[PDB]
C-alpha cells in the first residue's frame with residue numbers, strides 16, 4: 001500500500017448525504033458528519049495497515065490485516081464486521097451489520113486518493129489531497 005501511506009485532507013464530496021440516508025444515518029448525525037473535513041492518515045507496519053480519520057465530528061482508527069475480518073464501530077455508531085482486501089490496487093472495505101452491507105473503495109488517481117462509498121444503488125465520491 002505504499003502509494004496510500006501518508007496524511008490526506010478531504011477536498012470534495014458528492015452525494016454523501018444520500019449515501020448516509022441509504023445507510024440509515026439519522027438527521028442530526030448526517031448534518032454534523034456532512035460538515036466535517038476529515039484528515040485520513042494511513043500507515044503500514046509489517047502486515048498491519050492503520051487508517052485514522054480525524055475531524056471535528058469524530059476521531060476514528062482501524063488497524064487490520066488484509067483479508068482478515070475485524071469488528072469496527074463506525075463514526076455513526078454502527079457495530080459492523082469489516083473485511084478489507086486489495087483488488088487490483090484498490091482497497092475494498094466491506095462492512096456488514098443487521099443483514100445490510102456497504103462497500104468503501106479507496107484508490108489512488110493522479111495525486112488524489114478517491115474514496116467511493118456505495119450502499120445499494122447510491123454512490124458517494126469523496127476526494128482527498130495530500131495534506
Ligand SMILES: O=C(O)Cc1ccc(N2CCCCC2)c(-c2ccccc2)c1
Pocket residue numbers: 020023025033034036038040053055057058074075076104115117126
Ligand atoms: O472517510 C470517508 O471520507 C468516507 C466515509 C464513509 C463513512 C463515514 N461515516 C459513516 C457513515 C456516516 C457518517 C460517518 C465517513 C465519515 C468519517 C468522519 C467524519 C465524517 C464522515 C467517511
